Amino acid sequence: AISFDNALGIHQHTVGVRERNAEVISTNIAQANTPGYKARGLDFAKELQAATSGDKLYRLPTQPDTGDGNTVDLDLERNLFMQNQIRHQASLDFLGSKFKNLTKAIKGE
Amino acid sequence: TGAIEGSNVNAVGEMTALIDLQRQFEMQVKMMSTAEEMDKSSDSLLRM
């Protein structure tokens, strides 16, 4: 034992995935008005598995498009972006406390 | 022969169509206004 992997856990890979998800969600919000653009989804479980050791998912629209072809539901995108930011803040707190505890033990302070 | 045929426009029929087109037009305009009103409200979600 006594290794950074065994000490940090999955809180280092989770942060990267949460930032990846925010990039995907922000892309859907920006591309909301572009006709023909299809909303992009991200699988957290698969992304976390790939990050730990190392495809395109589309979001099914709740209602038909008005003709443009864009399936971005901006009501859902804001809700997911808000959730992603909260869980990302927790992951930073979880990962940040891993380093603080490691520093505390190696210095006894 | 000796006569000219006029138009068959029913003036009342057009006028009653006009007043119904106005009201239906105005009701949809209110739908546009309440659509952006909902959109403005659902913007504090990302306002941390």
PDB file of C-alpha atoms in Angstrom:
ATOM      1  CA  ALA A   1       0.000   0.000   0.000  1.00  0.00           C
ATOM      2  CA  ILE A   2       1.005   3.622   0.672  1.00  0.00           C
ATOM      3  CA  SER A   3       0.342   4.774  -2.894  1.00  0.00           C
ATOM      4  CA  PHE A   4      -1.419   7.740  -4.453  1.00  0.00           C
ATOM      5  CA  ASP A   5      -3.861   5.461  -6.308  1.00  0.00           C
ATOM      6  CA  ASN A   6      -4.879   3.522  -3.149  1.00  0.00           C
ATOM      7  CA  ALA A   7      -5.037   6.865  -1.276  1.00  0.00           C
ATOM      8  CA  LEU A   8      -6.983   9.131  -3.691  1.00  0.00           C
ATOM      9  CA  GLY A   9      -9.410   6.467  -4.817  1.00  0.00           C
ATOM     10  CA  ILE A  10     -11.785   7.230  -7.683  1.00  0.00           C
ATOM     11  CA  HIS A  11     -12.037  10.924  -6.738  1.00  0.00           C
ATOM     12  CA  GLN A  12      -9.281  11.790  -9.241  1.00  0.00           C
ATOM     13  CA  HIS A  13     -10.929  10.099 -12.224  1.00  0.00           C
ATOM     14  CA  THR A  14     -14.403  11.348 -11.271  1.00  0.00           C
ATOM     15  CA  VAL A  15     -13.320  15.001 -11.452  1.00  0.00           C
ATOM     16  CA  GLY A  16     -12.123  14.584 -15.034  1.00  0.00           C
ATOM     17  CA  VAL A  17     -15.389  12.945 -16.075  1.00  0.00           C
ATOM     18  CA  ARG A  18     -17.470  15.675 -14.418  1.00  0.00           C
ATOM     19  CA  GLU A  19     -15.530  18.315 -16.350  1.00  0.00           C
ATOM     20  CA  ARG A  20     -16.033  16.233 -19.497  1.00  0.00           C
ATOM     21  CA  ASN A  21     -19.781  16.123 -18.830  1.00  0.00           C
ATOM     22  CA  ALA A  22     -19.903  19.901 -18.347  1.00  0.00           C
ATOM     23  CA  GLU A  23     -18.198  20.335 -21.720  1.00  0.00           C
ATOM     24  CA  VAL A  24     -20.848  18.099 -23.306  1.00  0.00           C
ATOM     25  CA  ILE A  25     -23.750  19.836 -21.553  1.00  0.00           C
ATOM     26  CA  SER A  26     -22.439  23.309 -22.422  1.00  0.00           C
ATOM     27  CA  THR A  27     -22.093  22.204 -26.047  1.00  0.00           C
ATOM     28  CA  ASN A  28     -25.774  21.234 -26.177  1.00  0.00           C
ATOM     29  CA  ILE A  29     -26.797  24.591 -24.688  1.00  0.00           C
ATOM     30  CA  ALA A  30     -24.666  26.522 -27.184  1.00  0.00           C
ATOM     31  CA  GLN A  31     -25.884  24.392 -30.107  1.00  0.00           C
ATOM     32  CA  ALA A  32     -29.536  24.588 -29.016  1.00  0.00           C
ATOM     33  CA  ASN A  33     -30.550  26.918 -31.854  1.00  0.00           C
ATOM     34  CA  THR A  34     -28.522  25.190 -34.583  1.00  0.00           C
ATOM     35  CA  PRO A  35     -30.962  23.255 -36.807  1.00  0.00           C
ATOM     36  CA  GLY A  36     -30.187  19.602 -37.417  1.00  0.00           C
ATOM     37  CA  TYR A  37     -27.944  19.354 -34.348  1.00  0.00           C
ATOM     38  CA  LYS A  38     -28.672  16.307 -32.189  1.00  0.00           C
ATOM     39  CA  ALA A  39     -28.307  16.507 -28.417  1.00  0.00           C
ATOM     40  CA  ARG A  40     -25.294  14.620 -27.071  1.00  0.00           C
ATOM     41  CA  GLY A  41     -25.405  12.533 -23.905  1.00  0.00           C
ATOM     42  CA  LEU A  42     -22.612  11.084 -21.786  1.00  0.00           C
ATOM     43  CA  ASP A  43     -22.587   7.849 -19.785  1.00  0.00           C
ATOM     44  CA  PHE A  44     -20.901   8.466 -16.437  1.00  0.00           C
ATOM     45  CA  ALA A  45     -20.429   4.783 -15.579  1.00  0.00           C
ATOM     46  CA  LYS A  46     -18.712   3.958 -18.875  1.00  0.00           C
ATOM     47  CA  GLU A  47     -16.586   7.119 -18.805  1.00  0.00           C
ATOM     48  CA  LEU A  48     -15.446   6.432 -15.238  1.00  0.00           C
ATOM     49  CA  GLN A  49     -14.556   2.853 -16.195  1.00  0.00           C
ATOM     50  CA  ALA A  50     -12.576   4.081 -19.208  1.00  0.00           C
ATOM     51  CA  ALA A  51     -10.766   6.700 -17.112  1.00  0.00           C
ATOM     52  CA  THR A  52      -9.804   4.156 -14.441  1.00  0.00           C
ATOM     53  CA  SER A  53      -8.227   1.876 -17.081  1.00  0.00           C
ATOM     54  CA  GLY A  54      -7.024   3.544 -20.274  1.00  0.00           C
ATOM     55  CA  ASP A  55     -19.770   5.036 -28.286  1.00  0.00           C
ATOM     56  CA  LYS A  56     -21.748   8.171 -29.158  1.00  0.00           C
ATOM     57  CA  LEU A  57     -24.877   8.382 -26.996  1.00  0.00           C
ATOM     58  CA  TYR A  58     -27.769  10.565 -28.162  1.00  0.00           C
ATOM     59  CA  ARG A  59     -30.593  11.880 -25.991  1.00  0.00           C
ATOM     60  CA  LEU A  60     -34.117  10.918 -27.029  1.00  0.00           C
ATOM     61  CA  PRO A  61     -36.296  14.046 -27.347  1.00  0.00           C
ATOM     62  CA  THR A  62     -39.388  14.341 -25.186  1.00  0.00           C
ATOM     63  CA  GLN A  63     -41.311  16.107 -27.981  1.00  0.00           C
ATOM     64  CA  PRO A  64     -40.886  16.365 -31.763  1.00  0.00           C
ATOM     65  CA  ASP A  65     -38.847  19.200 -33.204  1.00  0.00           C
ATOM     66  CA  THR A  66     -40.618  22.132 -34.844  1.00  0.00           C
ATOM     67  CA  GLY A  67     -38.953  21.394 -38.185  1.00  0.00           C
ATOM     68  CA  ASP A  68     -35.360  22.477 -37.624  1.00  0.00           C
ATOM     69  CA  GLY A  69     -34.345  19.004 -36.462  1.00  0.00           C
ATOM     70  CA  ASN A  70     -32.660  20.032 -33.190  1.00  0.00           C
ATOM     71  CA  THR A  71     -33.445  17.701 -30.279  1.00  0.00           C
ATOM     72  CA  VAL A  72     -31.894  19.847 -27.528  1.00  0.00           C
ATOM     73  CA  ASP A  73     -34.335  20.336 -24.640  1.00  0.00           C
ATOM     74  CA  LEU A  74     -32.897  23.455 -23.017  1.00  0.00           C
ATOM     75  CA  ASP A  75     -35.068  22.914 -19.930  1.00  0.00           C
ATOM     76  CA  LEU A  76     -33.302  19.597 -19.286  1.00  0.00           C
ATOM     77  CA  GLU A  77     -29.823  20.874 -20.191  1.00  0.00           C
ATOM     78  CA  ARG A  78     -29.898  23.567 -17.499  1.00  0.00           C
ATOM     79  CA  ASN A  79     -31.098  21.049 -14.907  1.00  0.00           C
ATOM     80  CA  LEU A  80     -28.310  18.602 -15.777  1.00  0.00           C
ATOM     81  CA  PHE A  81     -25.682  21.360 -15.822  1.00  0.00           C
ATOM     82  CA  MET A  82     -26.784  22.475 -12.351  1.00  0.00           C
ATOM     83  CA  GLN A  83     -26.579  18.898 -11.054  1.00  0.00           C
ATOM     84  CA  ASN A  84     -23.191  18.316 -12.695  1.00  0.00           C
ATOM     85  CA  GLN A  85     -21.716  21.420 -11.056  1.00  0.00           C
ATOM     86  CA  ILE A  86     -22.865  20.340  -7.582  1.00  0.00           C
ATOM     87  CA  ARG A  87     -21.483  16.812  -7.932  1.00  0.00           C
ATOM     88  CA  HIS A  88     -18.245  18.220  -9.363  1.00  0.00           C
ATOM     89  CA  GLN A  89     -17.882  20.487  -6.322  1.00  0.00           C
ATOM     90  CA  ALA A  90     -18.317  17.477  -4.036  1.00  0.00           C
ATOM     91  CA  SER A  91     -15.684  15.544  -5.997  1.00  0.00           C
ATOM     92  CA  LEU A  92     -13.185  18.388  -5.591  1.00  0.00           C
ATOM     93  CA  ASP A  93     -13.937  18.436  -1.861  1.00  0.00           C
ATOM     94  CA  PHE A  94     -13.566  14.645  -1.726  1.00  0.00           C
ATOM     95  CA  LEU A  95     -10.315  14.705  -3.710  1.00  0.00           C
ATOM     96  CA  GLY A  96      -8.996  17.777  -1.906  1.00  0.00           C
ATOM     97  CA  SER A  97      -9.496  16.113   1.471  1.00  0.00           C
ATOM     98  CA  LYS A  98      -7.484  13.102   0.279  1.00  0.00           C
ATOM     99  CA  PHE A  99      -4.373  15.256  -0.137  1.00  0.00           C
ATOM    100  CA  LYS A 100      -4.960  17.133   3.127  1.00  0.00           C
ATOM    101  CA  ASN A 101      -5.215  13.880   5.090  1.00  0.00           C
ATOM    102  CA  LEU A 102      -2.090  12.514   3.389  1.00  0.00           C
ATOM    103  CA  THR A 103      -0.171  15.694   4.234  1.00  0.00           C
ATOM    104  CA  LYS A 104      -1.519  15.572   7.794  1.00  0.00           C
ATOM    105  CA  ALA A 105      -0.256  12.021   8.357  1.00  0.00           C
ATOM    106  CA  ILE A 106       3.183  12.556   6.787  1.00  0.00           C
ATOM    107  CA  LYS A 107       3.761  15.622   8.990  1.00  0.00           C
ATOM    108  CA  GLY A 108       1.707  14.965  12.136  1.00  0.00           C
ATOM    109  CA  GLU A 109       0.205  18.457  12.043  1.00  0.00           C
TER     110      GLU A 109
ATOM    111  CA  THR B   1     -77.497  40.604 -72.529  1.00  0.00           C
ATOM    112  CA  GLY B   2     -77.727  44.208 -71.399  1.00  0.00           C
ATOM    113  CA  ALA B   3     -76.362  43.570 -67.903  1.00  0.00           C
ATOM    114  CA  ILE B   4     -73.032  43.185 -66.103  1.00  0.00           C
ATOM    115  CA  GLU B   5     -72.256  40.624 -63.398  1.00  0.00           C
ATOM    116  CA  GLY B   6     -70.691  42.024 -60.232  1.00  0.00           C
ATOM    117  CA  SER B   7     -68.646  40.347 -57.535  1.00  0.00           C
ATOM    118  CA  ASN B   8     -70.074  37.805 -55.086  1.00  0.00           C
ATOM    119  CA  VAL B   9     -68.085  38.984 -52.061  1.00  0.00           C
ATOM    120  CA  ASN B  10     -70.172  38.610 -48.900  1.00  0.00           C
ATOM    121  CA  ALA B  11     -69.097  41.680 -46.937  1.00  0.00           C
ATOM    122  CA  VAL B  12     -70.460  40.381 -43.626  1.00  0.00           C
ATOM    123  CA  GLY B  13     -68.752  37.029 -44.152  1.00  0.00           C
ATOM    124  CA  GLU B  14     -65.397  38.771 -44.510  1.00  0.00           C
ATOM    125  CA  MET B  15     -65.965  41.070 -41.524  1.00  0.00           C
ATOM    126  CA  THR B  16     -66.835  38.234 -39.138  1.00  0.00           C
ATOM    127  CA  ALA B  17     -63.788  36.337 -40.395  1.00  0.00           C
ATOM    128  CA  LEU B  18     -61.659  39.410 -39.652  1.00  0.00           C
ATOM    129  CA  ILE B  19     -62.748  39.703 -36.018  1.00  0.00           C
ATOM    130  CA  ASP B  20     -62.064  36.005 -35.419  1.00  0.00           C
ATOM    131  CA  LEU B  21     -58.642  36.253 -37.074  1.00  0.00           C
ATOM    132  CA  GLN B  22     -57.774  39.199 -34.823  1.00  0.00           C
ATOM    133  CA  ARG B  23     -58.683  37.398 -31.595  1.00  0.00           C
ATOM    134  CA  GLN B  24     -56.879  34.190 -32.569  1.00  0.00           C
ATOM    135  CA  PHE B  25     -53.860  36.261 -33.604  1.00  0.00           C
ATOM    136  CA  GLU B  26     -53.786  38.073 -30.256  1.00  0.00           C
ATOM    137  CA  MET B  27     -54.150  34.880 -28.207  1.00  0.00           C
ATOM    138  CA  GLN B  28     -51.129  33.312 -29.910  1.00  0.00           C
ATOM    139  CA  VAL B  29     -49.125  36.485 -29.253  1.00  0.00           C
ATOM    140  CA  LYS B  30     -49.837  35.976 -25.548  1.00  0.00           C
ATOM    141  CA  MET B  31     -48.536  32.419 -25.938  1.00  0.00           C
ATOM    142  CA  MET B  32     -45.296  33.867 -27.322  1.00  0.00           C
ATOM    143  CA  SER B  33     -45.047  36.247 -24.360  1.00  0.00           C
ATOM    144  CA  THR B  34     -45.626  33.521 -21.769  1.00  0.00           C
ATOM    145  CA  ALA B  35     -43.080  31.308 -23.544  1.00  0.00           C
ATOM    146  CA  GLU B  36     -40.260  33.809 -23.012  1.00  0.00           C
ATOM    147  CA  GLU B  37     -41.541  34.600 -19.511  1.00  0.00           C
ATOM    148  CA  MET B  38     -41.102  30.944 -18.555  1.00  0.00           C
ATOM    149  CA  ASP B  39     -37.679  30.890 -20.221  1.00  0.00           C
ATOM    150  CA  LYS B  40     -36.477  33.912 -18.239  1.00  0.00           C
ATOM    151  CA  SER B  41     -37.635  32.356 -14.963  1.00  0.00           C
ATOM    152  CA  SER B  42     -35.918  29.033 -15.743  1.00  0.00           C
ATOM    153  CA  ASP B  43     -32.527  30.723 -15.897  1.00  0.00           C
ATOM    154  CA  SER B  44     -31.688  31.003 -12.179  1.00  0.00           C
ATOM    155  CA  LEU B  45     -30.933  27.266 -12.190  1.00  0.00           C
ATOM    156  CA  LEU B  46     -27.433  28.075 -13.494  1.00  0.00           C
ATOM    157  CA  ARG B  47     -27.181  31.236 -11.354  1.00  0.00           C
ATOM    158  CA  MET B  48     -25.098  29.839  -8.474  1.00  0.00           C
TER     159      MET B  48
END
